[PDB]
Amino acid sequence: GRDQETTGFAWWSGNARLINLSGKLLGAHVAHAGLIVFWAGAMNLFEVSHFVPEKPMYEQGLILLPHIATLGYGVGPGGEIIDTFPYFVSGVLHLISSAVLGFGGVYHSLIGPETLEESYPFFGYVWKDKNKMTNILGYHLIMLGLGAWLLVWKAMYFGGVYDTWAPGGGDVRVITNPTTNAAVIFGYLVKSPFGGDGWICSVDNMEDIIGGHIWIGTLEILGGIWHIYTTPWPWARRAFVWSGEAYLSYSLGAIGVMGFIACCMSWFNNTAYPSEFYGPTGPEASQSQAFTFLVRDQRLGANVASAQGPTGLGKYLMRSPTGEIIFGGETMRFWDFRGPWLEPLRGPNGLDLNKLKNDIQPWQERRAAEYMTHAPLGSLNSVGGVATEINAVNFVSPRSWLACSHFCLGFFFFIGHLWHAGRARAAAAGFEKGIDRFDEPVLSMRPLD
Amino acid sequence: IDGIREPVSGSLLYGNNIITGAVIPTSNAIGLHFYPIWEAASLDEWLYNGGPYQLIVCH
C-alpha cells in the first residue's frame, strides 16, 4: 500500500498513485481484466441457468446469450435454440480463466515488483519514451488484429455464423464470399451518419461484416508492425502530450465514441444484432404494427392501397419522400427500415402491393406480430409498454438495455476524456496544482482584454 | 412538423407572440434523414418541411 503525503493523492484518487509504478499498474489491469472475464463468465452462466426454452431469448433479459447465438452456437433455423451447452462452455471457460487473470492481477499488485524497469527491461516503460509506447501499442494491435481474424475464421471455416438474411430463413451460414472490396468496405466509413445512411450501423449483410473484419484484421497486424518498427514523427511530437494520463485520455475519447456507436448499433442494426435473438429494433416494431393491421384489414375486406387515412395521406400505404411505397401512419419516419421478414414483400419501387395483396406468407405475419408486442419500450422496473400501461407483462428489450447502458457509459467516458485530457495537458504544462501566485500570467497581460 | 400535411405556425409574422412563437422541428416524413438546403428543390420546400430547424440544431 501507500499513503497520501508520500504521493500527494488522497484515498479517493489513489489509483493515480500507481502511475509511475509499472508493476503495480500491471497488476491493476490484469486483475481488472479478470473482472471483465469474471463478469462474462458469471453473467453467462446466470443467463444459461435462467434460460427457459419456451420463451424467446429477448424476452428473458438475456444480453450475453444473443452474442453467442449470433456466432451460431446452439441455434437452429429461424432462431430456434437447439441446445444450451455451447453457451455453458463459454461461461465456464471465462469463469475459470478469470481465476488465472485474477491470480496474476493479485500477484503483481501485492508480491510482484513495484516498477518493472530495472529487472525486466522488456516490459519496463517510461511514459515519455515514445518508442516503447508505440512498441506496446503495436503488440496489442496484433492482438486485436488476430482477434479480428477469429471472427473471420469462425465465419469462414469454424461452422459459420448466424445470417438472419439467409435464403430459407435465418440460420447459421458459412460466409464463403466475404466482401474484400475497398470501395464497399471503406464506403461505410465515409457514409453520412444520418437517415438512409446510418454511417456503419446499416451494414446490411454478414458478407460485409466478415469482409470488413478481414480489413480490420490485416490493418491492425500491419499497423502493429508499423508501430513496433517506428517512433512517432516530429509532427506527432508537436501535437500530443506524452504522459500516462494523456495516453489514458486518448483512449477515453476513442472508447467513448465506441460506446455511442454500439449504442446506435444495437438500436438500429438487425444483421450483426439479429432480431430473433435481440428482439425487434425501434424501427422494426413500429413497421411491424403497420404490417400487422394491413394484414388484419385485408382479411376483413378492405383495399389497403385505396384506404385513405384521416389526414388524407393513406392509412396503410403511403409514398416515401423519395418516392417509395412505404407503410403509412407515424411510422413514415422508419420507412428506410429493412427487415428479413419484410424485404421478401419489397420490390424496386418500394413495397410491391401486388406481392403484398396475394403473397403475404403465414410465417411473416407470425414474426411481425411477435415484434409488435415486443417493442423496445418498457419501464425501469421492466413493465413493458408505453408509460400509460398496466403491470401485465415483464419485458424490456435487450436493445433497450444495450443502448441505454452504452449511451451512459459512452457519455461518462467522454466526460472522462474531458477530465483527463484537460488535466494531462495542464499537468504537463505545470499548472495543474494552481496559479503560481508569484507569476500569475493574467497579471502580465494587457487589461481591457 | 407532424408529416401529415398540416402546417404549424411558429413565426411572429404568422400570428405569434414571444411565448407561442417557435422554430418548428423538422417534418416527420424526413425523420432522421439529412435535409440541407441543397437537397430541396426550392427554398420554400425547405421551409415547408422543417428545414430551418435541422440547420439550427446541427450548427
Partner: peptide, 30 residues
C-alpha cells in the same frame, strides 16, 4: 403591428447585450 413591437423588444435586448460586452465598465486592478 404587435410583431413590430415584439422584434423591437428582441432587438433592444440584443442591443444591451452588445453594449454590455463591448462597452462594459472596465475592471480596474490594484
Amino acid at each position: 403591428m404587435e410583431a413590430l413591437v415584439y422584434t423591437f423588444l428582441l432587438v433592444g435586448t440584443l442591443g444591451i447585450i452588445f453594449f454590455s460586452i463591448f462597452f462594459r465598465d472596465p475592471p480596474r486592478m490594484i
